[PDB]
Amino acid sequence: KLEINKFNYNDPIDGINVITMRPPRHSDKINKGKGPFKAFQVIKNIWIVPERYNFTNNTNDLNIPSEPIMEADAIYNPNYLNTPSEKDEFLQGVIKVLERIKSKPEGEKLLELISSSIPLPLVSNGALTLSDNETIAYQENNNIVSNLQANLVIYGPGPDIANNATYGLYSTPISNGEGTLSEVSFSPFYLKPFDESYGNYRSLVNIVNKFVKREFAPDPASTLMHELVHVTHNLYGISNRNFYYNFDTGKIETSRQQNSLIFEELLTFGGIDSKAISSLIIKKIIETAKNNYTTLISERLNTVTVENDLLKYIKNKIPVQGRLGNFKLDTAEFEKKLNTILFVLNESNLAQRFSILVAKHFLKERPIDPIYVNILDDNSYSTLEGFNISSQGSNDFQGQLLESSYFEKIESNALRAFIKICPRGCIEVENKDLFLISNKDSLNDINLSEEKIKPETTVFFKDKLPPQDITLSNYDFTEANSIPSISQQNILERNEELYEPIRNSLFEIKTIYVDKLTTFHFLEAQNIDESIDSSKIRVELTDSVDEALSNPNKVYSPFKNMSNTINSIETGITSTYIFYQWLRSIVKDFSDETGKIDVIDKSSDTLAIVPYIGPLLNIGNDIRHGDFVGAIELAGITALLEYVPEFTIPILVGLEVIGGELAREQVEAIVNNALDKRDQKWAEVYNITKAQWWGTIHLQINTRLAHTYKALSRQANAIKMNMEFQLANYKGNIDDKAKIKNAISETEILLNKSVEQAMKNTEKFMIKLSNSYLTKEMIPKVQDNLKNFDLETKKTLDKFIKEKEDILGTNLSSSLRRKVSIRLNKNIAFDINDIPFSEFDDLINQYKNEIEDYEVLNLGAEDGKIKDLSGTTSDINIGSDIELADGRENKAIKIKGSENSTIKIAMNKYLRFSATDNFSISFWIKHPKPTNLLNNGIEYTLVENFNQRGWKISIQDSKLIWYLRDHNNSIKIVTPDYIAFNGWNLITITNNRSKGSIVYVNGSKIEEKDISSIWNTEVDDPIIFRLKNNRDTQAFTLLDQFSIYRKELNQNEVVKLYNYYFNSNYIRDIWGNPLQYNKKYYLQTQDKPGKGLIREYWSSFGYDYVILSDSKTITFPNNIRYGALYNGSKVLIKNSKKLDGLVRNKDFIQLEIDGYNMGISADRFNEDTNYIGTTYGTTHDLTTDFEIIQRQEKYRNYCQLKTPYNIFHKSGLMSTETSKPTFHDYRDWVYSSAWYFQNYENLNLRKHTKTNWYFIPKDEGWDED
Amino acid sequence: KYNENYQLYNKTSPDKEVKKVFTNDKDYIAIEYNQNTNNPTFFSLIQKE
Amino acid sequence: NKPNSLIFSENSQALRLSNRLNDENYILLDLVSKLDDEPLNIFYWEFI
């Protein structure tokens, strides 16, 4: 509906769309003389002004400050946007960014909301009129000609040509709900990249990208779409600067020295940082904005008797109700809209809707040099997609990487900001490396007070609002996009003071005198300057920081085990075999040694402390020298952090109520409102202390993680220096270095993967420590003051009920007194479900981020067609004699072994596994029992990627063989047996190229073999599923969910993947298939194999007993006898209504043997062991309804049969007892066994065999004939 | 449950119920905001069998 | 994540509530769009 005008800077001034405005801050003395600037109305009430923003004192100067600043990423270029060509380029770039935003529906809604939500206009003679707070003055010859409406003015960047900012116009309208004009300064070409190297565990790029560094560049659409949210806050009168983190702390003396960070700023960015401060600032803003808007509507909007278009703007912007002369702010949708503005609309949500990657932290732990990108080049940036132009495969944030050849790097001219830690050569550590510690009194001097609790206060309930609406499906804007622009000549002055934002503090150069080596000393000891040539100098890893500090060659390594395999090897290696052995030893030692963890087992804490941080980072040496895991026990956080704040909170005066000629129905509401206000005060003080924790405690944890990442990355780069030095001395051979160079590149990739796993562990154990500190040592301090406030409130309220008691009535007085006494005596629990870093967030998607993320093949059957369920490849061609048969969960692939039932997958870059690529292969198999003896000793393949080099899964006589073959080396791992017993077996083979290949069958380890000698198993022939070299033309095999992963799943992930297949609560028959409701099954006990169920009738008792039949055995072709499965009678599982579904964990069933329902007696006749009978014989009544259960693990192929509880017999588990009750022969009688059910969980696993039942199907692949 | 009538909400506007619209020839289901007249409609999940 | 909600999805398109046009959010089929690995709140419906 809203139109973006396509303009060129050379377009003639129309006076309605292209103007020469006078800057809105012309009254400031620093802006005296700054002449009119050309402006283009890109959207209604949105103007682009291609000029540098230099109107506030913060941005008054554009030159290089000639003094170090507090920002590491900054570009200073005074002569930018000074020429019409650059202005035209900037205007076109901004228009392109705006039409990129408008492309998605969410961006269109945001732009409509900005162009429609005007500031509150003044009142004159009952009519709404514009002022300089909403209009820009189009001017000629030092004479204002026309004031055009403008909700937003877009300039170029300030001094920092890579920085974004949003400024208001007038001080008071920003915060008192009136709203104000906004000025947004940003550059769409110059960008500030963010280093996302250890935050998101989710794959930010392609799995086979070979990405050296995960450093992304922001999207200019999302960079601007951040400032649009600030514009909305200013337009609605929302921004308050009182909630700010003061980062100026002098006591710790090692502080990042950053500018004050507004809580509105983190709320606007969203993501992890907002969750700590979201509830507090949102609640305060909404609570104060309700009062502000109610006062404005009461005194200004209600004094309007004219229906100008500005009234339409205001009625659409503010959800008022009533009629002219009586307007009332409807609190419900107003609160909902404010929540949508503050909570729903932020950078992270909008960017995720736009498929754009964001930093996950507003704060920059590792700032990167800002870059330059020409977004006007449609090859790199497109309005439909953005940087990630999906071409020949989905990028998935792949175009954001700053090595994409269009991100023109710029050398930074900003002066370096360093602090000299110079003890008594003394270290100069950058400002970006210092700890980020917010001042402990940042949230002091806050109000934390409320007025007298009147009726109809309606405290804001954030939990009663409907959930998020990112798209903004409601809030239509067609009413406000059809309103033209006013453009009046004379406007109301609205004499108010200009809004001047905080002047950024100047960085000061200070020196620190410390008496012991700090953590910065330890980091700098692990550094070598890039001036050190990789050749001619060998960086020998050492163990003493002092030696590494003084000697440029050596590097401090606390690993003290890489230094053995990195050093001690003679330079001038004579063979590529030695350069592969050493190279794999490096990878193995680094991966195994940075994964060292210590799992202390204090319940509900279970810290997985990595001990090497002890000598890696000088943390726990003060408390307990030489021990770090022990140092954590003595002090969980005090050892880990450099500053325990010892916080404080205001005095929390008790609340009060109003006094007047009140009524019963409203004094009761006053009491309820007072109780609710007390609850919200408790929650608000909890949120205040949570914000203090995030500012002071969590940011230290984040900077500790950054320090750990620096240390580990420099360890890895020292290893890389040594490897490339060794390659520089390949004396053994000539012109054979290329393959060794590829090996070193892959090795560096593997080292980076080990580093990121180590950092995952470190973050995992530090976040838990910080959360525990917040919950244990911080809230209890608050609860005392909160209890005192609660007692004061209780006293005031109970005195408020002694009076006004006659108005209440005795019953209402009693109820109110009871409610006050009970409620204002407890402790309100702290709600931590919205805590920034929670275990539930890390566990709800554990399987997706650890197993399914690395799946590059999953060959299954869907909708009756064989396909790759993962979707990675589609060039899978199947033979004409392949079929789909009933399988484990959905149809299974059935290879008929006729040499035409060939499935083959053309190998692509996903399935090509190089020398150093770990990989896992997991598949379900159902191998038929061999019906004839013509294939023994003849090994035949099942699935092979093999060209006399590669991998091959074959099937010998009931044993599954896994084979790797390099050019000279090989591995052959054989599963024991029972593959050919016609049972669904999950075989998963995990190949860690460094350590060894492990084979698990049904989640249980079989064998692990050394794979360190095998190097190239890659051939371009397709992965072939076939049964070649099979002497039997009728032999087949069922395959299901053959999947390949590009990671080595360890035992935990293997057993997790094996549980995943039994997520549903289905009951499994002996083969492993789900149990159905109209299929006839053979029924046998786990004990007494070979005996099925039959019936015999006792005429004297008139009872049809169910009895295990006579035992029989089957002879295998290999002459080994086994208990027969197809014995006795076929029982038919049923339902009370014939559901014909699949049997579940606790379904109520009705076994029907030989057409007669089975059940227990329903009278006192059978009081001895409760023999189970059938409906045959009507002398005794039966209770047929059984109940299949699985008390054991879900994957067991047997189930228990709980009997119903009638009043005569207790509930028991169907079992069998061998007996000769009377003169009839000695048999095995089936009985309910009320004793087993009661004591089931106390019995040992051997007695449980009595209660289990198998439910044998008649299945092809197992046949006794 | 199948063949059991319920009231349908969009999980985003629980205060407004999905109501069939018959004021036009092209009948459809929509969430109405006028709410001058309230008359709920019931949606039940039914399959062929 | 939201256990008391349903998605009426046909092929890759799930039922959705359109933008407000005439005080009526008419229901249309739309391609499912994710947010934090899960679709938006609009595609989820509740039965009472």
Task: Tell me the DSSP string of A1173-1238.
Answer: EESSSSSS-EE---EEE--S-TT-S-BEEEPP--SSS---B-EEEEE--SSSPPEEEEE--HHHHH
For A26-67, give the DSSP string: TTSGGGTT---EEEEEEETTEEE--S----SSTTS--S--SS
Technique used to solve these coordinates: cryo-EM
**Marked catalytic residue, from A71, A89, A196, A227:** A227
Residue A1107: phi and psi, rounded to 5, are -135, 140
Q: C37: which chain A residues are within 8 Å (Cβ-Cβ)?
A: 845, 848
A265 is in an annotated binding site: yes
Give helix A810-823 / helix A664-693 axis angle, nearest 10°. Answer: 10
The CA R_g of chain C, rounded to the nearest whole Å, is 11
Alpha-carbon span A393 to A405, nearest angstrom: 19
Q: Report CB contact under 8 Å: C47, B12.
A: no
3-state secondary structure A281-297: HHHHHHHHHHHHHHHHH
Q: A473: which chain B residues are within 8 Å (Cβ-Cβ)?
A: 12
Give residue A489's region: left, alpha or beta (phi > 0; psi -120 to 50).
alpha
CB pairs under 8 A between A and C: 35
| Chain center to CA of A860 | 28
Q: Answer for the pair A316, A479: CB distance below 8 angstroms, yes or no.
A: yes
A521 is in an annotated binding site: no
DSSP state of A1121: E
Hey, which residues does C35 pair with through a beta bridge? C38
Q: Is A451 a catalytic residue?
A: no
Residue A22: its H or E element: strand A18-22
Q: A466: which chain B residues are within 8 Å (Cβ-Cβ)?
A: 11-15
Helix (H, G, I), strand (E, B) or coil at A215: strand
Neighboring chains of A (3 or more beta-carbon pairs < 8 A): B, C
Measured CA distances, A419 to A361, A456, A552, A589, A1077 (Å): 24, 56, 21, 36, 76
Q: Answer for the pair A42, A50: CB distance below 8 angstroms, yes or no.
A: no
B20: distance to nearest CA of chain C, Å? 10
Alpha-carbon span A1106 to A1201, nearest angstrom: 14
Measured CA distances, C22 to A105, A124, C42 (Å): 18, 33, 19
Alpha-carbon span A1020 to A377, nearest angstrom: 38
Helix ranges (H only) for A552-599 are: 562-566, 576-593
SS3 content of chain B, % helix, strand, coil (to 5): 0, 25, 75
A106: distance to nearest CA of chain C, Å? 11
Q: Answer for the pair A519, A707: CB distance below 8 angstroms, yes or no.
A: yes
The encoded tokens of residue B48 equal 């062929």
Alpha-carbon span A829 to A840, nearest angstrom: 19
Neighboring chains of C (3 or more beta-carbon pairs < 8 A): A, B
Q: Answer for the pair A381, A96: CB distance below 8 angstroms, yes or no.
A: yes
| Chain center to CA of C14 | 6
Alpha-carbon span C36 to A845, nearest angstrom: 11
Alpha-carbon span A161 to B13, nearest angstrom: 43
Q: Report CB contact under 8 Å: B13, A467.
A: no
In chain A, the N- to C-terminal Cα span, in Å, equals: 77
Triad A658, A662, A665: Cα angle to 5°: 115
Exposed e or buried b per residue across A636-673, where buried means at least 16 C-beta atoms within 10 angstroms of its C-beta? bbebbbbbebebebeebebbbbeeeebeeeebbbbbeb
- Which of A343, A473, A476 is best to mutate for the B interface (most B CBs within 10 A)? A473
Give the closest residue to A113 by CA, choosing from A469, A484, A479: A479
Hey, which residues does A488 pair with through a beta bridge? A147
B12: distance to nearest CA of chain A, Å? 6
Can you tell me which residue has the tokens 């067991």?
Answer: A1196
| CB-nearest partner of A473 from C19, C35, C37 | C19
The encoded tokens of residue A1120 equal 């080994």
Exposed e or buried b per residue across A1185-1212, where buried means at least 16 C-beta atoms within 10 angstroms of its C-beta? ebbbbbbeeebbbbbbbbbbbbeebeeb
Q: Does C44 touch chain B (CB under 8 A)?
A: yes
The encoded tokens of residue A960 equal 């599954």
Alpha-carbon span A788 to A791, nearest angstrom: 5
Question: A541-542 and A876-878 as β-strands: parallel, antiparallel, unpaired?
Answer: unpaired
Q: What is the resolution of this structure in A?
A: 3.1
Q: B30: which chain A residues are within 8 Å (Cβ-Cβ)?
A: none
Helix (H, G, I), strand (E, B) or coil at A488: strand
Identify residue A186 by its one-letter amino acid code.
F
Residue A775: phi and psi, rounded to 5, are -75, -30
Alpha-carbon span A1255 to A1243, nearest angstrom: 23
Measured CA distances, A1230 to A1092, A1095, A1109 (Å): 11, 10, 11
Provide CATH code, domain A18-433. 3.90.1240.10
A226 is in an annotated binding site: yes
Measured CA distances, A960 to A930, A1003, A1196 (Å): 14, 15, 22
Nearest residue in B to C45, CA atom:
B10
Q: Report CB contact under 8 Å: A473, B12.
A: yes
Alpha-carbon span A364 to A378, nearest angstrom: 30
C9: distance to nearest CA of chain A, Å? 16
Q: A474: which chain B residues are within 8 Å (Cβ-Cβ)?
A: 13
Q: Is A567 exposed, middle or buried (0-12, 13-18, 19+ CB in 10 A)?
A: middle
- Which of C2, C15, C20, C45 is best to mutate for the A interface (most A CBs within 10 A)? C20
Give the closest residue to A497 by CA, choosing from A22, A23, A21, A27: A27
The encoded tokens of residue A99 equal 């039409």
Give the closest residue to A136 by CA, choosing from A485, A518, A425: A485
Q: Report CB contact under 8 Å: C27, B29.
A: yes
